[PDB]
Amino acid sequence: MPPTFSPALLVVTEGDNATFTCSFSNTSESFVLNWYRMSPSNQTDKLAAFPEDRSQPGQDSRFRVTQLPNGRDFHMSVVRARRNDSGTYLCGAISLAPKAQIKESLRAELRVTERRAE
Numbered sequence: 001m002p003p004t005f006s007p008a009l010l011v012v013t014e015g016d017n018a019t020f021t022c023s024f025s026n027t028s029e030s031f032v033l034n035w036y037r038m039s040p041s042n043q044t045d046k047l048a049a050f051p052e053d054r055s056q057p058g059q060d061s062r063f064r065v066t067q068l069p070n071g072r073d074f075h076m077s078v079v080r081a082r083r084n085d086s087g088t089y090l091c092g093a094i095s096l097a098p099k100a101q102i103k104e105s106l107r108a109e110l111r112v113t114e115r116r117a118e
Contacts, residue, residue: 005108012111017077024091028096050066089107
């Protein structure tokens with residue numbers, strides 16, 4: 001039922017492929033799923049989408065969407081995360097029609113900790 005994005009806090013190490021889970025419910029039989037970073041200025045920046053609504057080849061390819069065999073569950077991965085990727089994130093969906101509008105999920109935190117000594 002509700003548009004969800006979890007865990008509410010993900011803690012990872014520098015160079016990890018940091019993954020969150022989105023979950024969505026819709027009346028529309030088909031839709032675009034999309035992903036955002038939320039700024040301290042309270043704006044949002046587009047990261048990735050499925051089907052790919054990212055438009056341009058200037059999108060950072062580290063941000064990955066993968067569709068799960070659950071049928072309505074989705075893997076949002078920051079492939080090779082650095083300390084600068086720490087911040088707030090949130091998920092969304094929108095129908096294929098031109099009259100559509102974005103349904104957003106609740107927000108979560110990404111936290112990237114220092115690469116350990118070995």
